[PDB]
Design a protein around this ligand. Structure first.
Ligand SMILES: *[C@@H]1O[C@H](CO)[C@@H](O)[C@H](O)[C@H]1NC(C)=O
Length: 228
């Protein structure tokens, strides 16, 4: 096979560090619920427009390091973007949670640092790392009836943002294309009842179409999460 081929020449997120202002806080736009519990575990933060990207960036994970105040470890920590930072104060502005903010400090200085209020950090997008056992969850948003479906596609550790979500009822052969809306909520209204079990197929930025067969059961209920 000759000599090992170097990395595939494909479009990708950088690998260089970007600069952003950072502050913290102690029902987000992305619709995530128990953020203190796994897989996020408090490692979350509000991200402004170029990070949130109207919702497309809800699963987003970023490495964030800090060298500014003395308490900063200079070591990187991964944060999951769970909301929208409507009031940015710099080109890039991360509004991290208290836990996340402090997580950039030297062992035991998490509070000393959290007292800094604002600081300058460096960040770069990275593939999320969820604890094993974590499965891509599809949440049927409330307001869904048998003629309207609106769902979230959580924990897709994929490469990029999911850019399309389709469903197929166990029995038919045509794909129903969902429309993207703010908060990464895919929606579809139809004349035909949305009864039978649906297979959800979501494709990521790359082009990688992955399917979750019959994940949404017949007789599903609004505001309920079903996993694969
Ligand atoms: C390059 O792309 C192919 C097809 O997706 C994949 O199987 C292969 O492992 C990739 N190579 C590297 C070095 O990542």
């Amino acid at each position: 096979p000759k000599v090992p081929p170097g990395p595939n020449i494909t479009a990708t997120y950088g690998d260089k560090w970007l600069d952003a202002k950072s502050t913290w806080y102690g029902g987000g736009a992305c619709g995530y619920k128990d953020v203190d519990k796994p897989p996020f575990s408090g490692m979350t933060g509000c991200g402004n427009t170029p990070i949130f990207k109207s919702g497309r960036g809800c699963g987003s994970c970023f490495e964030i390091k800090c060298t500014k105040p003395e308490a900063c470890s200079g070591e990187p920590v991964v944060v999951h973007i769970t909301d929208d930072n409507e009031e940015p104060i710099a080109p890039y502005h991360f509004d991290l949670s208290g836990h996340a903010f402090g997580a950039m400090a030297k062992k035991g200085d998490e509070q000393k640092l959290r007292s800094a209020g604002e600081l300058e950090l460096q960040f770069r997008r990275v593939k999320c790392k969820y604890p094993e056992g974590t499965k891509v969850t599809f949440h049927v948003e409330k307001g869904s009836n048998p003629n309207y479906l609106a769902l979230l596609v959580k924990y897709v550790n994929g490469d990029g943002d999911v850019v399309a979500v389709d469903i197929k009822e166990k029995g038919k052969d045509k794909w129903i294309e969902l429309k993207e809306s703010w908060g990464a909520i895919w929606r579809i209204d139809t004349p035909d009842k949305l009864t039978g079990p649906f297979t959800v197929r979501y494709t990521t930025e790359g082009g990688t179409k992955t399917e979750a067969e019959d994940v949404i059961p017949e007789g599903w209920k609004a505001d309920t999460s079903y996993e694969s």
